[PDB]
Amino acid sequence: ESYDVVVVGGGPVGLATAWQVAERGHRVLVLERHTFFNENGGTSGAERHWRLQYTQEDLFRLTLETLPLWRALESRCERRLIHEIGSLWFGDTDVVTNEGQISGTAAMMDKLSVRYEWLKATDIERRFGFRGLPRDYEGFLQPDGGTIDVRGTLAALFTLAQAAGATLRAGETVTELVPDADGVSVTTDRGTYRAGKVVLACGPYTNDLLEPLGARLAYSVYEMAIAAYRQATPVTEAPFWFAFQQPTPQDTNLFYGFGHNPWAPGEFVRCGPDFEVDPLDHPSAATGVADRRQMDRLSGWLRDHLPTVDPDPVRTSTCLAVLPTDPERQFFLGTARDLMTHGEKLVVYGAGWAFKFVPLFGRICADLAVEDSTAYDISRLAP
Ligand SMILES: *Cc1cc2c(cc1C)nc1c(=O)[nH]c(=O)nc-1n2C[C@H](O)[C@H](O)[C@H](O)COP(=O)(O)OP(=O)(O)OC[C@H]1O[C@@H](n2cnc3c(N)ncnc32)[C@H](O)[C@@H]1O
């Protein structure tokens, strides 16, 4: 069997890519090692944050061009996937984190004429329910940000990809890739394939396939804890929130949470720590069980600073975050041209907070896998 494009990985990025390749009239195969919709990779959980604001101007331009792609996808599947509950960023305004920097981002919103409300500690505590915040903590609320329905998005992409004619095959793991001048040989535990080009969208497993080709990307994998809490005190407004703080000697000291998912039953909210600590040597080392210390830190912080939730989690789980090792970079997206000979035959999406970009990254990987280039400016994201 041969295809114009073989996509390695059936997570959101691989499915969005396959949908775009197939809709453009090309033959595409998606190979997934486990099952579609699995909760063992970087896409576990029900919600992700959609935001317009970014500290880097190039990424801020990309969120603005991704918004219409989300609207188009919502119309295709007839389901609102983004719920604009608001994006609240607050804390130390100068600390640089993997989420960005508050002060630098506020400057960018002014420049791109994106609206926001500036808030002081007292305002944050009164309107949103936080307590005991250091008096100098400040931040902003960007009203157009919100929550993304993860499972609704995956179902939409899967359905769209299959309807467009993509071949979606689960339970098959790619063990080797060998690009050459005429295409790429793909070996799996089930068989062999030839592809015009291959899109690698395998999350934390990218280096397993790039290593024998003499390449390796500089990213780290973190098994982050996530937990659900019962909302004790009835809500006023409950946006997505991220607390920007200076790190401690033991961890990054960053926390975030969501208001109740508008599509879900009951009154639970999800919160978690954003700790870039204890990276995994290999994703196989993941335990699948929320780290005790991370959980203690999260529940402890919520206990003191967000009394609107009951501090004893109802459920806990994990998610594998894959982030560039270098804090100056946010994403790895492009081809492997500068990493190996014939690398232009390998398109790679390999690290970052990317769920918000799924519609865009799918279109860009599709552009690179079919026509050598894309109209979007992603020069800085090159691997
Ligand atoms: C962990 C996490 C991520 C996250 C976040 C909070 C946490 C705790 N919050 C985000 C947010 O608010 N907004 C945002 O934009 N992103 C946020 N993220 C990141 C986002 O979840 C990830 O960027 C996204 O889920 C990545 O999707 P992707 O499609 O790239 O990756 P994946 O879901 O891991 O799927 C890859 C698939 O590949 C399969 N695989 C792996 N190796 C193979 C081989 N060899 N052969 C075949 N298939 C393979 C994996 O079984 C997986 O399904």
The yes-or-no answer on residue 263 being catalytic is no
- Catalytic-labelled residue, pool 47, 149, 274, 291: 274
CA atoms of 158 and 166, how far apart (whole Å): 9
Two tokens at 16? 């969005």
Strands 346-349 and 333-335, by their bridges, are antiparallel
- Partners of 88 in the beta sheet? 141, 241
The yes-or-no answer on residue 303 being catalytic is no
Q: Which amino acid is at 266?
A: G
Domains of the chain: 1-85+145-218+326-383 (3.50.50.60), 86-144+219-325 (3.30.9.10)
C-alpha of 209 from chain center: 21
Q: Give exposure, 164-183, as e/b (b: 16+ Cβ within 10 Å).
A: bebbbeeebebeebebeeeb
Minimal-distance CA residue to ligand 1 atom 36: 202
Helix (H) or strand (E) holding 7: strand 2-8
| Dihedrals phi, psi of 172, to nearest 5 degrees | -135, 115
The answer to whether residues 227 and 319 touch, using CB atoms and an 8 Å cutoff, is no
Tell me the torsion sign for CA atoms 160, 367, 112, 357: positive
Helix (H) or strand (E) holding 120: strand 117-120
Among candidates 276, 329, 27, which has minimal Cα distance to 166? 27
Q: Give exposure, 346-373, as e/b (b: 16+ Cβ within 10 Å).
A: bbbbbbbbbbbbbbbbbbbbbbbbbeee
Over its C-alpha atoms, the chain yields an Rg (Å, rounded) of 21
Phi-psi region of 161 (alpha: psi -120 to 50; beta: other; left: phi over 0): alpha
The answer to whether residues 333 and 361 touch, using CB atoms and an 8 Å cutoff, is yes
Is any atom of ligand 1 closer than 6 Å to the C-beta of 11? yes
The answer to whether residues 357 and 66 touch, using CB atoms and an 8 Å cutoff, is yes
Among candidates 54, 68, 50, which has minimal Cα distance to 112? 54
- Catalytic-labelled residue, pool 23, 47, 99, 367: 99
Is any atom of ligand 1 closer than 6 Å to the C-beta of 51? no
CA atoms of 95 and 79, how far apart (whole Å): 37
CA atoms of 39 and 120, how far apart (whole Å): 38
- Partners of 139 in the beta sheet? 90, 119
What kind of experiment solved this structure?
Answer: X-ray
3-state helix, strand, coil in the chain (%, to 5): 30, 30, 40
The answer to whether residues 344 and 372 touch, using CB atoms and an 8 Å cutoff, is yes
The ligand 1 atom nearest the CA atom of 32: 48
Is any atom of ligand 1 closer than 6 Å to the C-beta of 269? no
Instruction: Determine the Cα angle at 359 with ends 326 and 331, to 5°.
Output: 5
The answer to whether residues 114 and 148 touch, using CB atoms and an 8 Å cutoff, is no
CA atoms of 52 and 67, how far apart (whole Å): 8
Among candidates 324, 226, 224, 321, which has minimal Cα distance to 270? 226
3-state secondary structure 160-218: HHHHCCCEEEECCCEEEEEEECCEEEEEECCCEEEEEEEEECCHHHHHHHHHHHCCCCC
Q: What is the resolution of this structure in A?
A: 1.8
Instruction: Determine the Cα angle at 334 with ends 196 and 322, to 5°.
Output: 115
Determine the length of the chain.
383
Two tokens at 187? 């070996």
CA atoms of 227 and 271, how far apart (whole Å): 6
Is any atom of ligand 1 closer than 6 Å to the C-beta of 199? no
C-alpha of 190 from chain center: 30
The answer to whether residues 354 and 309 touch, using CB atoms and an 8 Å cutoff, is no
C-alpha of 106 from chain center: 22
Helix (H) or strand (E) holding 44: none
CA atoms of 16 and 307, how far apart (whole Å): 39
The yes-or-no answer on residue 126 being catalytic is no
C-alpha of 110 from chain center: 25
CA atoms of 133 and 123, how far apart (whole Å): 11
The ligand 1 atom nearest the CA atom of 240: 12
The answer to whether residues 177 and 197 touch, using CB atoms and an 8 Å cutoff, is no
Contacting residues for 60 by C-beta, under 8 A, at least 6 apart: 52, 53, 54, 108, 112
CA of 323 to the centre of ligand 1 (A): 11
